[model samples]
Target: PMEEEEVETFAFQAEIAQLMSLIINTFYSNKEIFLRELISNSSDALDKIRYESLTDPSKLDSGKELHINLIPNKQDRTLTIVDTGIGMTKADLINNLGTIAKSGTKAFMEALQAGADISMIGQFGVGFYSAYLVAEKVTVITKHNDDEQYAWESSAGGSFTVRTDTGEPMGRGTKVILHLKEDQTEYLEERRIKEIVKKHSQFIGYPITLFVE
Candidate 1:
């Protein structure tokens, strides 16, 4: 029998904080690329869940279609990327977004220290941090099985705040809101966003939808 153990809270190590700041400031040179990073991340998430559901079909709730939607609100200067994929639990938020875990962040740091190529660092599932490139504030709304929907918000400085979702996740999935900076308003244009999608993700397994209205 599988024994379920309560999850434990973990804090970011001191060195990891410095590493995060340096990585963010030096690695990403363009703010517009945040969209590509985000869309790529969503594509990966959808792929994972779809692959998992191959064996355990129940993983994907009935009547759910796998897709990704990008909506930019010029009025509010906000860009949202929504996906019906594997959503995160509160524990996943803390473990994935809060600290350097054994395999992911730790491995990236080791590669950097040893002078290995770091171009693929974000590709290793660390692209979530790229939201800071444009957003002064970032919010992630997610829901998963065995956990209630929750919202996680942060300035990406040194800390973040998480709270339980009062309303359900629009559905079982994840939505990332990027509060765009003044100079980054071009991202709100449908034509520009569509071009980007076709360039980097046209061949993606799932349909990538851009909602202009």
Candidate 2:
């Protein structure tokens, strides 16, 4: 008989949930700003990988053309943002996506209690959750150099599922698919998505492509 393997589950610390709600609800007024935030994230990822490649050229096998792709599917009411950059691992997903209580949060709150300036330490890592404002479902497909491809799926209401990807990621990078809500269908239009990208990210360091089908 084969032995069963044990599975481990983790829980978030107190104050984390409250911090999450406050940040998600109050940080940004316009939901569309998520597009800019995501693009900025991709740019940062590419910069990291590029810098690492300078010491180890093998990391540049994907080529120097770091870029992003915005694909809108009206039929499915989905908008996908793809980027060729360093991807995350399973542990990273849990630690990064599951946890909301950042070290900075405590210090920020302490400053507020002390009557010190608190404006500088607003929510630090809530950008990914912004997808909730515009998406009913979110799917992330990523491939990292040191690990196998994986898919992370979630709905706006909270909670997420992670699984190994059956289909391979096209290359070394990450792709975020936003299943738009009925009211947010405008994001599925090429003109709107492109305009948003141009308005906030045209001067970004990488080229961004729009794919329509």
Candidate 3:
């Protein structure tokens, strides 16, 4: 029933997978930083697009400014972080999400190689996966200017899948949905989530907005 070309699944590189498991288990004493890391990742994504836009103008910005949106649904135990920034293509999903700490930009890779600070783990590309600390499963729905829209899903483990999603286009950027674990219900609270944003992301270069119910 599924088209072969529309879907593909891949396992993480052995060492990378092991590192992820280790980090997830003992990332830090504070779990709230996951949100911070996620926000930082969004900032990095926005920074990339701005840089690209400056280089070639049309390569990134088609005259639309960038921002981040948070959509939280307590009933479904879901919270999504969407950004109007450089999103990932199918290949990017495999290389970035599927593989650990594989960033699109060389500076990220350099920081990763140089063993950047644990707090700055976000810059190294490992911070995106930090969502799993509070989420049992994670879904990344993105549309990059360079490729078609794709939905990437994974539950912390051995493998992850990517498939074309022609249903509704994301325009240009990424939307990451987190299926929160029971102990992480505070994340669903708008007050608490916004507070966390204010504390950790107060000075982030992009605007971060929340969806109110």
Candidate 4:
């Protein structure tokens, strides 16, 4: 039984600092690349869970539908990307997200800053960081087969915090909520979201549903 107050703060890796600077300050020709990157990662997560269930059928015990959901809240100015996939454990959150740049740190940033023609941001393994391009704050709630639910949050700043979640529990998956910046509120529009998804993740294996109220 983990206490909800047990929160841990970790500084972003040096590479992440540079990348965040580039992502936050620099203007990209394709602002919609963030959507594509996120959907690509969700697709990967779904694939991992499916593959794991093949060997250990019990991994699917959570009975979560293997799909991706996009919910945009206009009132709250938030866009959520939910995936019933191989969720991240606490350690996973620290390692996968914390240590974003393991290999080429500077070279990648240089290329991106130079305005290289790169569309599929997923290739750089830093696609997750692109979320900051549109959002002011990002919160991630994930539950893994081997660990309890946890929340990871950051504001594209120098540090991020991770802690056990005491609120509503998820069966097995990840939920990413992007608190949209004032200028990026267009993402809350269903038409804009659908167009981006259609152009980028149309061939994704998992079903992507958008909830509108």
What shift in Å separates residue 161 of candidate 1 from its native position after superposition? 1.4
Q: Which residues of candidate 3, in runs, are more than 4 Å off?
A: 1-5, 23-28, 60-63, 100-120
Cα RMSD to the true fold for all candidates: 6.4, 5.1, 4.5, 2.4
What does candidate 2's lDDT look like per residue over 2-111, in tens digits?
A: 85433333344344444434444543346676688778777877887888898998987865668888888888888888888887777776677655456655555455
What clash pairs does model 2 have? none
> How would you encode candidate 1's per-residue C-alpha lDDT over 1-213 as one tens digit per residue?
584433333445555555567555654444455677777777877887888889988887732699898999999999999988788888777667766444466667676677654445575556566667667778888887668888877765676777776654465678999887687688789888887677756666788788888
Worst 10 residues of 2 by lDDT: 116-125
- Give one digit per residue, the lDDT tens place, for model 4 in 65-184: 899999999999999999999999899999889655556456667677676644645566677988988998999999999899999999966889999987698899999999999999
Residue range 87-115, candidate 3, lDDT tens digits: 88788888877665454334533554566
- Decide which is better by TM-score, 1 or 4: 4
In terms of lDDT, the poorest run of 10 residues in model 1 is 3-12
Q: What TM-score does candidate 4 get on C-alpha atoms?
A: 0.94
- 1 or 3, which is superior by lDDT? 3
